[PDB]
Structure formats: C-alpha cells, structure tokens
Amino acid sequence: AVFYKEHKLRNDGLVITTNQGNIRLQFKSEAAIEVLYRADSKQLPSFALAQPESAIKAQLTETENHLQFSGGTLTARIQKRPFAISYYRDSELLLAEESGFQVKINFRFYLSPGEKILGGGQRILGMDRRGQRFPLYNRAHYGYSDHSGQMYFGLPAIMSSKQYILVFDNSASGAMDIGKTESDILQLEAKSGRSAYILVAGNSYPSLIENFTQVTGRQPLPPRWALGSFASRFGYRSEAETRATVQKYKTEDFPLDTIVLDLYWFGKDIKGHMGNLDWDKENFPTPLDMMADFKQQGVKTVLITEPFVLTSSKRWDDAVKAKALAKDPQGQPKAFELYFGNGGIIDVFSKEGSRWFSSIYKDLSKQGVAGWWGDLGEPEMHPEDTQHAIGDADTVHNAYGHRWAEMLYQQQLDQFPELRPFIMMRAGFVGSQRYGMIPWTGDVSRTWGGLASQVELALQMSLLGFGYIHSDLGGFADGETLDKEMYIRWLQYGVFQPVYRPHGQDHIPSEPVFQDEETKAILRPLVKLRYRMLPYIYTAAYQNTLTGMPLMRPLFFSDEKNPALIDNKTSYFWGDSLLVTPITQAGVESVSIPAPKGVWFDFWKDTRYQTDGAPLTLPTDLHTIPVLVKAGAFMPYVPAVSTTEDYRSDSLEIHYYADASVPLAQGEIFEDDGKDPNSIKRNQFDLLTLQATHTDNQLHFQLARTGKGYRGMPERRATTLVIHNASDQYQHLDINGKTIAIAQADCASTPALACYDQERRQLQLVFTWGREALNLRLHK
Numbered sequence: 047a048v049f050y051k052e053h054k055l056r057n058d059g060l061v062i063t064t065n066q067g068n069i070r071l072q073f074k075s076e077a078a079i080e081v082l083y084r085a086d087s088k089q090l091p092s093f094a095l096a097q098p099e100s101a102i103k104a105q106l107t108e109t110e111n112h113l114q115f116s117g118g119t120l121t122a123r124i125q126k127r128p129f130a131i132s133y134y135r136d137s138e139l140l141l142a143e144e145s146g147f148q149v150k151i152n153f154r155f156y157l158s159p160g161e162k163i164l165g166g167g168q169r170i171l172g173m174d175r176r177g178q179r180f181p182l183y184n185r186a187h188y189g190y191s192d193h194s195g196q197m198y199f200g201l202p203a204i205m206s207s208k209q210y211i212l213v214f215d216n217s218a219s220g221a222m223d224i225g226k227t228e229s230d231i232l233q234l235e236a237k238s239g240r241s242a243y244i245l246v247a248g249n250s251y252p253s254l255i256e257n258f259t260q261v262t263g264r265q266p267l268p269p270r271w272a273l274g275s276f277a278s279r280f281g282y283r284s285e286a287e288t289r290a291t292v293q294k295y296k297t298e299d300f301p302l303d304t305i306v307l308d309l310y311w312f313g314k315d316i317k318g319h320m321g322n323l324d325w326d327k328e329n330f331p332t333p334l335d336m337m338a339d340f341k342q343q344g345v346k347t348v349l350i351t352e353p354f355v356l357t358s359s360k361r362w363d364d365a366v367k368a369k370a371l372a373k374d375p376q377g378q379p380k381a382f383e384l385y386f387g388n389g390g391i392i393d394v395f396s397k398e399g400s401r402w403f404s405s406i407y408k409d410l411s412k413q414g415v416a417g418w419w420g421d422l423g424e425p426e427m428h429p430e431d432t433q434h435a436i437g438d439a440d441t442v443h444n445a446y447g448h449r450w451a452e453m454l455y456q457q458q459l460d461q462f463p464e465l466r467p468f469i470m471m472r473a474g475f476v477g478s479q480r481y482g483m484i485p486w487t488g489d490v491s492r493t494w495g496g497l498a499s500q501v502e503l504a505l506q507m508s509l510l511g512f513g514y515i516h517s518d519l520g521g522f523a524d525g526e527t528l529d530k531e532m533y534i535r536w537l538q539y540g541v542f543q544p545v546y547r548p549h550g551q552d553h554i555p556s557e558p559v560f561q562d563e564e565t566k567a568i569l570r571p572l573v574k575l576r577y578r579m580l581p582y583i584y585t586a587a588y589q590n591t592l593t594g595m596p597l598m599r600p601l602f603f604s605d606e607k608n609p610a611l612i613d614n615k616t617s618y619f620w621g622d623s624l625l626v627t628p629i630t631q632a633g634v635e636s637v638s639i640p641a642p643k644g645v646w647f648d649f650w651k652d653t654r655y656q657t658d659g660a661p662l663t664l665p666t667d668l669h670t671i672p673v674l675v676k677a678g679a680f681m682p683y684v685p686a687v688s689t690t691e692d693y694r695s696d697s698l699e700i701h702y703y704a705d706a707s708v709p710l711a712q713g714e715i716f717e718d719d720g721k722d723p724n725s726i727k728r729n730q731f732d733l734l735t736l737q738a739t740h741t742d743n744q745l746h747f748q749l750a751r752t753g754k755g756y757r758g759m760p761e762r763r764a765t766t767l768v769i770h771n772a773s774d775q776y777q778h779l780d781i782n783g784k785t786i787a788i789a790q791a792d793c794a795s796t797p798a799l800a801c802y803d804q805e806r807r808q809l810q811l812v813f814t815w816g817r818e819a820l821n822l823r824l825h826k
C-alpha cells in the first residue's frame with residue numbers, strides 16, 4: 047500500500063513524499079527523466095548519466111487525484127492513490143508503473159499488448175526479448191554459438207516499439223523479466239545498489255537514440271586508424287613472431303594499421319604471469335625498437351591488460367604495498383582462483399588502485415604503445431566478499447569495466463591531449479561509450495552459429511550506445527582445423543561492420559595473410575575495399591559522435607510503423623545506403639532479401655531492382671556477400687593505402703546511384719586530420735556536401751565545403767563522379783555555367799571530362815573540387 051502524502055520543488059527537481067519515503071524526479075533534458083526512489087537515503091551515484099547533477103527547468107501542475115511534471119516532450123503523470131507514475135510523449139502513453147518500487151530492489155511496470163522489447167545488451171535470444179527473463183550480471187560465455195541468456199556485456203536497459211528507452215541505473219547483480227513470469231509485467235531487480243530508473247523518449251528511433259546519447263554520453267571520434275586492418279591472434283609468442291607478422295602483411299599486400307599483442311608480451315605461459323604488466327624480455331628483447339620500427343611502417347601497437355594481479359607475478363608485493371588491490375572484509379588483499387592462477391583485482395574504484403594502475407599505463411604509453419586492450423572486465427571472476435572502496439563486488443560488478451574505461455580514458459587524455467584514445471574492452475555499463483569504449487563479443491566459437499549471431503549482438507549493442515561493437519573475425523574458440531568457407535564469409539561480413547579485427551586462438555591462424563591462395567585472392571580486394579571506403583565509414587563515425595546514430599542500423603529503421611521488422615537479424619544497414627545480408631551457412635546458393643519498398647542496386651554487379659514490398663532473390667558466390675545500394679546514394683571512395691597514416695583525399699571517386707524515384711538526395715563526406723580529439727568542437731574539419739536534384743529533363747548536383755579546414759587539407763581534390771543508371775538522353779553538361787559536350791564513346795580510353803558508357807549505363811564526370819561551391823548540371 048503506497049500513497050502520495052506531500053511534494054515540493056527544490057532546484058528544478060520535484061521531491062515527492064509517500065508513506066514509504068522520498069522520490070526525486072529530475073529532467074536531464076526535455077525528453078529524459080531520472081526517477082530516484084529512496085532519495086532520502088545514501089546510495090551509489092548514477093553511472094549511466096553523463097551529467098548526474100543536471101536538472102533542467104520543468105513545468106509542474108496539480109489536480110485532485112494526480113500531479114504532472116513536464117519537460118516539453120516527456121511528461122510524468124503521478125497518480126496519488128494508489129501511488130503510480132506513468133510516462134507520456136504528448137498524450138501518448140509510453141510506460142506505466144504497476145506496483146513500481148518495492149522492498150532488495152524491485153521495479154514493476156506494465157507492458158502494453160503487442161509492445162516489442164529490445165534490450166539487455168548481449169544476449170542471443172531473438173531481437174524482441176519480450177517473453178524472456180535473464181540476469182544482470184556480466185559474465186563470460188566461452189565458446190557460445192546460437193544461444194545465450196548471459197554473456198560479457200549486459201546492459202540494464204531496454205528499447206520499446208513505443209519509442210522509449212528505459213534504464214535501470216543500477217550497477218549490482220540483478221535480473222530483468224520482460225513479461226516472462228507475468229505476461230503483462232516488466233520487472234527489474236537487484237540485490238543492492240541504486241534504486242533509480244531513467245526513461246528517455248523520442249519521436250523516431252534516430253531521435254530516441256540522439257536523446258539517449260545526449261544524457262548518457264556521446265562516443266568521441268575514435269582515431270581514423272581504428273577503422274583500419276588489425277593483425278591479432280591469441281597470441282604472438284615473441285618479438286620475432288610479431289615482426290614476422292607485420293612483414294607478412296607487407297609481403298602479401300594486405301593493408302595493416304595495428305598489430306595487437308595478447309598475454310605472451312608479459313610472460314611465456316598463459317598462467318602465472320598476469321599482473322607483470324611489463325615486457326617478457328626473453329621473448330620481447332627490444333620492444334621500444336619494435337614499436338618504433340612498426341611506427342616507421344605506419345603500424346600501431348596495442349597491448350592487452352587485465353584487472354588481476356596474480357600472487358605469482360612480479361607486481362604482487364608492490365600492489366599490496368600500494369593498497370591497489372580490492373580487500374576482503376578482514377582488510378587484507380583479497381586473493382582468489384582464476385583460470386590464470388591465484389590473485390587479486392585492482393581496485394579501480396579507489397584512489398590508490400587508480401593511481402597505481404594509471405602510472406603503469408603511462409609508462410608503457412611513453413614507451414610506444416598507441417592503444418589499449420582491456421580484457422576480463424566483467425570482472426571475469428569476482429567473489430562476493432570482495433570489497434571495493436565504494437561497495438562489495440555484487441553491488442559494483444556491472445560498473446567495474448565502465449570505471450576501468452573512465453580511468454584509462456582520462457589518463458590517456460591527460461598524457462596525450464592531442465590524441466584520441468583507443469580503448470577496447472569486453473564489459474561496461476550504460477554510458478561507457480563516453481569513455482571511448484569499443485566492445486567486442488568475446489570468445490565466440492569457430493562455427494556458423496557463432497557468425498549467425500553477430501548481427502543480433504551488434505544491433506542490440508548499437509541501439510543502446512555502442513557504435514563500435516564488433517566480433518572476432520573468423521571466430522575465436524576451439525576448432526581443430528580451419529573452416530575455410532566460414533572464415534571467408536566472416537571476413538567478408540567484417541568489411542561491413544565496425545572494427546576489422548580478425549582474432550582467434552593461435553592453433554588456427556586468424557590473420558588473412560596466413561590463408562591459402564584462394565582465400566587471399568578473395569579477401570585481399572575486400573580488405574582494400576574497406577580502406578577505399580574510409581570516407582563512407584569515417585563519415586558514419588562522425589554522425590555517431592554527433593547524434594549516437596549507430597554505424598550498423600537494423601532493418602526496422604526502414605519503416606517505423608511496421609513493428610514486425612523488429613524481428614529481423616539477418617539484413618542490416620551499414621551507414622545510410624548499404625543493405626547487407628551476411629551469408630551465415632555453408633553452401634547457400636541464393637538469398638531472399640527483405641528490401642524496403644523502392645529502388646536498389648546490386649553493389650557488386652550494378653543490377654537495378656525496383657520493389658513494391660516483395661523480397662528480392664539474389665544468387666550468391668564465394669567472392670562476395672549480398673549488398674544492395676539504395677537509389678540516391680553517394681558512395682565516396684579514395685585510393686587504397688597500406689595504412690591510414692598514408693591516407694589522402696587528393697583523389698576522390700564518388701558513385702551516385704540515380705533513379706527518377708528519388709528526386710532529391712544528399713550525401714556528405716567528413717574529412718579532418720584523423721587524429722585530433724577536438725577537431726569537431728573547434729571546427730577543424732572539411733565537411734563536403736553533395737545534393738542531387740533529379741527531374742524529368744535534368745540532373746543537377748550542388749557541391750560545397752564547410753568548416754575551417756585542418757592542416758594538410760587539400761585545397762583542390764581531383765574528383766571522378768560516376769552516375770549509375772544515368773539516362774542515355776543527356777546531351778550536355780555545364781559546370782558552373784560553362785557548357786561541356788558529353789562523349790558517347792571511349793570513356794574508359796580517353797581523358798574525357800564527361801563521358802557516357804552506353805553498355806554500363808554510367809555517366810562519368812571528371813573535375814576539380816576546390817573550396818568554392820560547384821554546380822554540375824546535366825540536361826536533355
């Protein structure tokens with residue numbers, strides 16, 4: 047029995063008193079609200095909110111049976127007796143409390159009939175998680191395939207078909223029950239921790255996500271090199287082996303930006319050395335030279351680190367002496383068994399642990415290390431009587447990796463303020479993206495099932511803040527011999543997902559350079575294609591920094607009024623323009639692609655398809671996976687380079703997919719120095735825009751550049767524009783009012799300024815794109 051007793055406003059927040067205690071409501075923006083129950087009591091702070099203290103001005107009104115607290119899109123409606131808060135966008139009901147808050151921590155809400163619920167972070171259960179119940183406890187799932195209710199990186203959040211996001215702002219061992227136990231009840235639970243939730247609303251999925259990342263944190267632009275080719279295995283055993291691998295990329299003519307070193311960099315065995323956090327000199331005798339020698343070839347070095355210091359490690363006595371480790375309740379360093387051996391866990395929640403760990407990252411970063419891999423932050427083993435500075439293991443568990451990232455991010459920004467940190471981690475919390483976190487999906491099995499789950503995982507993480515979620519390309523766990531077809535399919539799909547990092551246990555090679563002749567002839571041009579497409583990918587990255595828009599988008603974005611599309615986890619958008627359908631079984635001879643209504647082109651073959659709703663059937667081959675381009679797309683390319691350190695946009699090649707069904711289209715290309723964390727804030731960029739206007743008798747392109755530019759920015763780019771599906775009736779072109787004839791022969795064989803290829807239906811324009819506006823007009 048809960049009822050309203052009294053309220054007041056203090057500092058823009060509404061504090062309500064019931065018979066059971068105090069409740070604080072603060073709008074964190076016009077469409078986001080933090081609801082803190084037990085507000086009177088001391089509890090852990092918010093982890094999910096980028097600005098925990100903020101509270102924007104809201105409107106309060108009172109009636110007999112209700113209060114109403116409104117931010118301008120989001121309204122909280124507070125029923126007095128019995129006490130129940132519900133949430134409205136306009137006057138559409140988003141979400142209503144059932145019994146709401148109780149005791150242990152427990153929140154109960156009604157689900158509407160037909161409401162679909164995405165969320166939970168990494169699970170393999172189906173896109174719509176309604177009807178499921180699962181824990182909120184980050185945990186390894188070694189060798190997963192086609193099913194999981196619990197893995198490395200859960201999120202205590204959901205996204206509904208009613209276009210709200212709900213966050214349980216609580217770091218503790220808990221559970222979510224999405225209308226499983228009771229069909230119309232969403233229940234959130236925890237053993238302890240903060241008793242708060244956050245509701246975010248939107249008028250569309252993009253703007254929900256913009257609103258969500260507004261209050262939880264925007265990912266800062268990673269360094270362009272994170273969009274490149276990684277060499278990684280578990281693991282290079284020696285400096286010789288690592289140098290031989292960088293060399294193999296060179297001698298095999300595969301692009302390579304970054305080599306990743308796993309745990310053998312600090313000791314010769316898997317067990318017993320962890321916490322050394324220093325070079326194993328018997329096997330890495332000259333590491334500063336190694337890294338400098340690699341940097342001369344434009345290659346970065348990334349090192350694995352972990353939260354555990356073993357008692358067998360060289361740093362045990364020192365970590366104990368500095369009070370860097372988590373303690374038992376008695377006050378001693380807590381030691382426990384891990385796979386790796388007997389050890390403790392660095393307390394990133396304390397000042398002492400944070401300083402000690404940070405000093406180590408500083409020193410290695412001074413030596414040459416460009417980036418950082420933080421493995422096992424679930425934490426992988428975390429006994430319940432472990433005590434951190436702010437709470438026990440079960441209370442802080444799901445926020446450990448999150449704070450680890452914060453610690454490392456701040457440290458790297460402090461040491462290198464002119465560089466963008468690279469932080470790759472296995473576990474975090476809502477908002478960990480504001481510390482640069484780049485998550486991967488853990489120890490996936492080397493099976494088709496492992497590959498077939500990657501899109502579901504990626505989309506689930508992308509929707510709730512994590513743009514750079516990716517997989518171990520080719521698969522990681524077990525196997526006894528390479529499954530060549532699965533490997534190829536996985537590295538194909540790789541091109542069209544966020545981070546190009548094949549990784550696997552080293553009894554089978556993960557790196558494409560170590561594959562047979564057929565596999566390399568298939569994958570070499572695709573890895574090059576990933577580099578030629580950097581303008582497309584880096585521009586989606588820019589948009590993610592700006593608005594939260596994930597790089598991978600689900601099919602369901604294509605039609606917000608068709609909730610059945612929510613179930614699709616086999617076709618997705620890579621940026622605005624490409625609909626990708628990975629092949630996830632052996633021997634598949636054709637696919638049916640549920641392309642939205644409109645016009646689509648085969649990316650590889652240029653074939654044009656129109657569809658009014660029905661799916662398209664495309665045949666498959668071993669050299670590609672099915673990718674369709676949306677009519678009206680501008681696909682930008684630069685020439686392939688070995689390393690993003692050599693990246694230039696002096697030469698652009700842009701492909702426009704014309705169709706009269708799209709009378710107006712746009713694209714952009716975001717260019718900056720690829721490394722400056724302040725490029726966007728300070729406008730040190732070159733933002734190229736392109737607008738096509740397509741009428742019955744003309745096709746008009748308007749080109750422009752904004753921003754203040756950056757150092758090394760080309761003033762003039764040689765630009766080849768290729769118009770696919772171009773009309774054969776264009777007689778003339780003018781460029782900024784100057785008329786040029788269109789050639790109809792020998793387009794591939796003359797330095798033609800405008801040439802129509804009648805066999806391919808492509809019109810090619812070659813011109814100089816300088817700083818001033820440019821207008822290209824084709825007319826029949």
Ligand SMILES: OC[C@@H]1[C@@H](O)[C@H](O)[C@@H](O)[C@@H]2N[C@H]12
Binds near residue numbers: 279
């Ligand atoms: O460090 C060894 C190895 C690493 O290669 C994987 O990527 C991790 O998820 C897991 N900890 C196991």
Ligand SMILES: O=C([O-])C(=O)[O-]
Binds near residue numbers: 706743772773
């Ligand atoms: O699209 C056009 O304008 C045509 O096909 O001739």
